[PDB]
What does this fold into?
Amino acid sequence: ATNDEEKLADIVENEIEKEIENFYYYILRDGKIYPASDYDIEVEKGKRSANDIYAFVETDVTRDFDEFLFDIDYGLPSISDILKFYLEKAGFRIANEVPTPNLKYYIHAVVEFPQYLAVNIYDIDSLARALRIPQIVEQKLGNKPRTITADEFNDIERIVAEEQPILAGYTYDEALRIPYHYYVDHNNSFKDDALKIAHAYLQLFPTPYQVCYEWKARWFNKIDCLKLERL
Amino acid sequence: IDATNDEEKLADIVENEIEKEIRKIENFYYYILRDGKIYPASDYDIEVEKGKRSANDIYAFVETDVTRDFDEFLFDIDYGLPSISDILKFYLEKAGFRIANEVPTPNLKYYIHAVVEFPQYLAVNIYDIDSLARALRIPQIVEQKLGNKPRTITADEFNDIERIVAEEQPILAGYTYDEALRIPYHYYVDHNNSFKDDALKIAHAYLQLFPTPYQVCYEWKARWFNKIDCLKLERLK
It folds into this structure.
């Protein structure tokens, strides 16, 4: 499992390196990487298959070191993406969505300006469980695979993002608002609550397979992530 | 009245600054002072912390978003509302409340959202903070939870109010505020057509109930911004 994740991080890193503009990518089961937008056009043309998508890559670019560290350590994935990814992997189909049923990984790549790259690899199922998605989908839709309406997607989305406490008694939307307030907006009044959320997040949410690199002489050079966090 | 004159002045202040920045993507947040001077917010906060500048002089807060996708640019123009956190903070402080040990901005009248499309276009959206807070039912929720007498509130009290405003009350076509942000994003930015009916319902309620921002648009043409009709803008690729 860790072997596949190391391979995926080098696939992401080589692509960012090659590029050094683009933010979203798909990694296929064969290890090929493509920008997500152009792949979606090929999928609908019938040229490429959505069944071949193995990993989804979201690239954030930063110029502030506090933001870079926050993104890599405490940054939450989009709840809309994980819900969509979980539903499709469980056999459901969302109206107007081409499903990606064999998606295993969610990858968040953060580039600090170039100076550093941090590649975070998450298992989608593990992430969906921590977001308390399976139980809500089961209570609301059942187990029988079907196409769900936009209204049904929205009803589930509301519960998971706004109604269910996930971290230190807070909902997903409060857990986006409160930490960022302290960590990125540098507002000290939200220290107590941000730290409570941070502490719960680190234990309850799946630890990502994290690979770090430093930009030196036209290359990204693999380094210990602790060195990045310690600088 | 003179509100429209002030808003036109504010949009040219923002435009002049984005233009100045392009000719030399550096700063995303700014303050506009009551004298019309514009400063990056991060630097200004340090000058306040030093006793050089006063948070009392802040008249408008500017948030600049930069985009490279036309659909996202149009969505940000049409639905680029200020952060709930910001409007609540701005309303509380303007009403005399103090949030824990944080430095208040009591004389803030406007929230400005500037969107730059890559450079090709600039759209400046000016929101009146009071009008926005009222449409969000912020005064009624603050009154029910804190009372009418201003005092210092805890971070927990701020959070409790924020949760009701954004995640509990049906504010637009029966949806909570957070659903009202997500549904049109799903329709316009995620390009999912099944979300059309709900997005249009929210759009209709939003255009009726919420205050219309004063919107000013510009096209980048030969090292300068040049005025353009905003509705002409939505036709451009």
Observations:
- Chain A has one domain: 1-231.
- The beta strands of chain A are 24-28, 33-35, 53-62, 93-94, 105-112, 116-123, 147-148, 209-216, 219-223.
- Residues 181 and 187 of chain A are 6 Å apart (CA to CA).
- Residues 2-19 of chain A form the longest helix (18 residues).
